[PDB]
């Protein structure tokens, strides 16, 4: 039980470590539905808009 | 040498090998312990996608290094 933020953060962190700044990954998360995992692997397929 | 395979779950797994190994051997040795399938794995180190036909000398890993490991799928 964590609230929206911290867990958004915390993926941030995670996939961060995985040279995905938190941005990108945050940014992919706005692009995920807030998904970190699919943060990830949207990191990957690329970042358009 | 030991080396460490980080997963998403933050599960760590450790594996003794070889720098002359290959990274399908690796691959194949993650699969014996962990049961993810080759065609799954998805693994990353200094921000390179290691590729199966290369060894882990070709990427200078040395003993200690940390891989992560990535899952590649359309399901759960």
Redesign the interface.
């Known amino acids: 039980t964590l609230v929206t933020g911290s867990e958004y953060e915390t993926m941030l962190t995670?996939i961060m470590?995985?040279?995905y700044e938190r941005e990108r990954v945050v940014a992919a998360l706005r692009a995920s539905y807030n998904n970190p995992?699919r943060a990830?692997?949207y990191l990957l397929t690329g970042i358009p808009g | 040498m030991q080396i460490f395979v980080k997963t998403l779950t933050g599960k760590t797994i450790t594996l003794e090998v070889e720098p002359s190994d290959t990274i399908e051997n690796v691959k194949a040795k993650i699969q014996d312990k962990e049961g993810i399938p080759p065609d799954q794995q998805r693994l990353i180190f200094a921000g390179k996608q290691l590729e199966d036909g290369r060894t882990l000398s070709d990427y200078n890993i040395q003993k200690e290094s940390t891989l992560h490991l990535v899952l590649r799928l359309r399901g759960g």
Do not use: L, Q, T
């Open positions: 995670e470590s995985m040279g995992h990830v692997e």
